[PDB]
Amino acid sequence: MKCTKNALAQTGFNKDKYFNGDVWYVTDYLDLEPDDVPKRYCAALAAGTASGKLKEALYCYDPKTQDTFYDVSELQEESPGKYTANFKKVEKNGNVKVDVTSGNYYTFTVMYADDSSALIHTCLHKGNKDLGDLYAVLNRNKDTNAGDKVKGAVTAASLKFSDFISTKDNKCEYDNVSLKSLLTK
């Protein structure tokens, strides 16, 4: 398929508050390229800096099988609030499962962020082809419902919040310790 290209980065985006090393949980998401196979997973990420690099680690959990997978990337700023990341898939300890490779990368845009919440758009590419295309509502607390400010950002992006899938009743489990330690790997 083709990923959405036009996402606007938050005006006055504050990169220090966003990239502070702490965890963002995905509370709600809108996947524009869902698999045919019914999938309902949980995800979280942490973005910060390590040894002078911008780093992002990712965590995905499947409550039906208890399967988990992790990724870590160095990020490169394309413009204020827009980033590219060449990811590698890892075990929770950093051991590499799938190396960084050319056409494996995602780009993302921070459309809205404040101290507690954010709306991001991501385009996922594997071996030089547009795979996933996805908006995510994030919060710093896993039990928190999307507040008025973020729902406002969803509206401003010409999206319908009712289209999003909630992770709230999904029996999610998180591994924050590993996400945070992956930042240095």
Ligand code: HEM
């Ligand atoms: C925070 C924004 C997101 C980013 C930056 C992101 C990034 C990624 C990356 C880099 C991969 C490739 C993993 C690898 O093969 O090493 C991936 C795959 C995947 N992600 Fe996300 N993701 C995001 C949101 C989500 C959400 C909200 C969900 C579900 C709740 C999700 C579920 C999945 C699934 C099921 C795959 C596997 C695709 C496959 O193996 O064919 N992602 N994502």
